[PDB]
Coordinates of C-alpha atoms and ligand atoms in Angstrom, one line a residue:
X1 CA 0.0 0.1 0.0
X2 CA 1.8 3.3 -1.3
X3 CA 0.3 6.4 0.9
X4 CA 1.2 9.8 0.2
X5 CA 4.4 10.7 2.2
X6 CA 3.2 13.7 4.7
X7 CA 7.1 14.6 5.4
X8 CA 10.6 13.9 4.1
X9 CA 10.8 11.6 7.3
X10 CA 7.7 9.7 6.2
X11 CA 8.9 9.3 2.8
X12 CA 12.2 7.8 3.8
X13 CA 10.1 5.6 6.2
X14 CA 8.1 4.4 3.1
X15 CA 11.1 3.8 1.0
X16 CA 12.7 1.6 3.6
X17 CA 9.3 -0.5 3.2
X18 CA 9.9 -0.5 -0.6
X19 CA 13.3 -1.2 -0.6
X20 CA 12.9 -4.1 2.0
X21 CA 13.2 -7.1 -0.6
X22 CA 16.0 -8.0 -3.0
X23 CA 13.9 -6.5 -6.2
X24 CA 12.0 -3.2 -6.1
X25 CA 9.2 -1.8 -8.2
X26 CA 10.4 1.0 -10.0
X27 CA 7.1 2.5 -10.9
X28 CA 5.9 2.5 -7.1
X29 CA 9.3 4.1 -6.1
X30 CA 8.8 6.8 -8.5
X31 CA 5.2 7.4 -7.7
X32 CA 5.9 8.0 -4.0
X33 CA 9.0 10.2 -4.6
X34 CA 6.7 12.4 -7.0
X35 CA 4.2 12.3 -4.4
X36 CA 6.2 14.0 -1.6
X37 CA 5.4 17.6 -1.8
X38 CA 8.7 19.5 -1.3
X39 CA 9.0 21.2 2.2
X40 CA 12.1 23.2 2.3
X41 CA 11.8 23.5 5.9
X42 CA 12.2 19.5 6.1
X43 CA 15.5 19.6 4.0
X44 CA 17.1 22.9 4.5
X45 CA 19.7 21.0 6.7
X46 CA 21.2 19.1 3.5
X47 CA 20.8 22.1 1.2
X48 CA 24.7 22.9 1.5
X49 CA 25.7 24.7 -1.5
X50 CA 29.4 25.3 -3.3
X51 CA 29.9 28.3 -5.2
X52 CA 31.8 26.4 -7.8
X53 CA 30.1 23.1 -8.5
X54 CA 27.0 21.2 -7.5
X55 CA 27.2 19.2 -4.2
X56 CA 26.0 15.9 -3.2
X57 CA 24.8 15.5 0.3
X58 CA 23.9 12.1 2.0
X59 CA 20.4 11.9 3.7
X60 CA 20.0 8.0 4.2
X61 CA 21.8 4.9 3.4
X62 CA 18.7 3.0 2.9
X63 CA 20.0 0.0 5.5
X64 CA 22.4 -0.9 2.9
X65 CA 19.7 -1.0 0.0
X66 CA 20.2 2.4 -1.6
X67 CA 22.0 5.9 -1.3
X68 CA 19.3 8.8 -0.6
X69 CA 21.1 12.3 -1.3
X70 CA 20.3 15.8 -2.0
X71 CA 22.1 17.6 -5.0
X72 CA 22.5 21.5 -4.7
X73 CA 23.0 23.1 -8.0
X74 CA 24.1 26.5 -8.0
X75 CA 23.2 28.7 -11.1
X76 CA 24.9 27.3 -14.2
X77 CA 26.0 24.4 -12.2
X78 CA 25.8 21.2 -14.5
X79 CA 27.1 17.6 -14.5
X80 CA 29.0 15.6 -16.9
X81 CA 27.7 13.2 -19.2
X82 CA 27.5 9.9 -16.9
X83 CA 26.2 6.4 -16.2
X84 CA 24.9 4.8 -13.2
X85 CA 26.8 1.7 -12.8
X86 CA 24.1 -0.7 -13.3
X87 CA 21.9 0.8 -10.7
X88 CA 18.5 2.3 -10.6
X89 CA 18.6 6.2 -10.3
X90 CA 15.6 8.4 -9.3
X91 CA 15.8 12.2 -9.5
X92 CA 13.1 14.1 -7.9
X93 CA 13.0 18.1 -8.1
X94 CA 12.7 19.8 -4.7
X95 CA 13.3 23.2 -5.8
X96 CA 13.8 24.7 -9.2
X97 CA 14.5 23.1 -12.6
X98 CA 17.0 21.1 -14.2
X99 CA 17.7 20.6 -18.0
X100 CA 18.3 16.6 -18.7
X101 CA 19.8 15.7 -21.9
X102 CA 19.7 12.0 -22.6
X103 CA 22.7 10.3 -24.9
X104 CA 23.2 6.8 -26.5
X105 CA 26.0 4.9 -25.2
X106 CA 29.0 5.7 -27.7
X107 CA 30.6 3.4 -30.1
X108 CA 34.2 3.0 -29.5
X109 CA 35.0 5.2 -32.8
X110 CA 36.2 8.4 -31.5
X111 CA 33.1 10.4 -32.5
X112 CA 30.9 12.8 -31.4
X113 CA 28.0 11.9 -28.8
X114 CA 24.6 13.1 -30.2
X115 CA 21.9 13.8 -28.1
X116 CA 18.9 11.6 -28.1
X117 CA 16.6 13.8 -26.4
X118 CA 16.4 16.8 -23.8
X119 CA 13.6 17.8 -21.2
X120 CA 13.4 20.2 -18.3
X121 CA 12.7 18.4 -15.1
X122 CA 10.4 20.5 -13.0
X123 CA 9.9 21.2 -9.4
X124 CA 8.5 18.2 -7.7
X125 CA 8.7 15.8 -10.8
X126 CA 10.5 12.5 -10.3
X127 CA 12.8 11.4 -13.4
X128 CA 14.1 7.6 -13.5
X129 CA 17.1 6.5 -15.6
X130 CA 19.4 3.4 -15.9
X131 CA 22.0 2.2 -18.1
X132 CA 19.7 0.3 -20.2
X133 CA 18.0 3.6 -20.9
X134 CA 21.1 5.6 -21.8
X135 CA 23.6 8.1 -20.7
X136 CA 22.6 11.6 -19.3
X137 CA 23.6 15.2 -18.4
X138 CA 21.7 17.0 -15.9
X139 CA 22.2 20.9 -15.7
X140 CA 20.7 23.8 -13.8
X141 CA 20.8 26.3 -16.8
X142 CA 19.1 28.9 -14.7
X143 CA 20.9 32.2 -14.2
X144 CA 18.7 33.1 -11.3
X145 CA 17.3 30.3 -9.5
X146 CA 19.4 27.6 -7.8
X147 CA 18.0 24.1 -7.9
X148 CA 17.7 21.3 -5.2
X149 CA 17.1 17.5 -6.1
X150 CA 16.6 14.4 -4.2
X151 CA 18.2 11.1 -5.6
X152 CA 18.1 7.6 -4.9
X153 CA 20.2 5.3 -6.3
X154 CA 19.9 1.5 -5.7
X155 CA 22.3 -0.6 -5.3
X156 CA 24.7 2.2 -3.7
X157 CA 27.4 2.8 -6.1
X158 CA 30.8 4.2 -5.1
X159 CA 32.3 5.0 -8.9
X160 CA 30.8 5.9 -12.2
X161 CA 32.1 7.3 -15.7
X162 CA 32.2 10.3 -17.2
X163 CA 32.0 10.6 -21.0
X164 CA 33.6 13.3 -23.3
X165 CA 30.8 14.5 -25.4
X166 CA 33.4 15.1 -28.2
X167 CA 34.8 11.7 -28.5
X168 CA 32.7 9.3 -26.4
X169 CA 35.9 8.5 -24.3
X170 CA 35.1 7.6 -20.7
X171 CA 36.8 8.2 -17.3
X172 CA 35.9 6.5 -14.1
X173 CA 35.1 8.9 -11.2
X174 CA 34.9 8.2 -7.5
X175 CA 31.7 9.5 -5.8
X176 CA 32.5 11.6 -2.8
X177 CA 29.9 13.3 -0.4
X178 CA 30.1 17.0 0.4
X179 CA 28.2 16.2 3.5
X180 CA 26.7 13.3 5.4
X181 CA 23.7 13.2 7.7
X182 CA 23.9 17.3 7.7
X183 CA 27.4 17.5 8.6
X184 CA 30.1 18.8 6.0
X185 CA 32.5 16.0 5.4
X186 CA 35.6 17.5 3.7
Ligands
LIG201 FE1 22.9 10.9 -13.2

């Protein structure tokens, strides 16, 4: 029974229940993430920005099943083109809007990566991606509005790949948290 999360704490409790097994219902997780009405009072603690790049702020470790984190995008901050290391990846906007560009996995001829599609993810919407759908870049193209998003990755992953849009060449990147449980972690 999927009920509407009344608070962020409620959402986290429901997520723990949804991931209690070894397989998850992607549509149910997306539905409950979308159903949580973003309340900045409840996530302000994690909304730790850096002037020069987006930050990743760990909220909950899902009893080993997932990493739940909040990403803080300054005006003009964007990500690499990247994969998600064979994990489910949910992205819910808590504030602002993000531009998502989808790419095909490159062939190993050093050619330009051509976009497959692009869309604007809007406040409170929850998107989903995995490696079978494609690669993506996420960007806050706003000049005036910081963006804040809530991400769930399952299983948790410690590394991923970033791709060069001009060649399709990839490099492995280690995931590091800007903060954990509201505490800055240099
Ligand atoms: Fe991503």
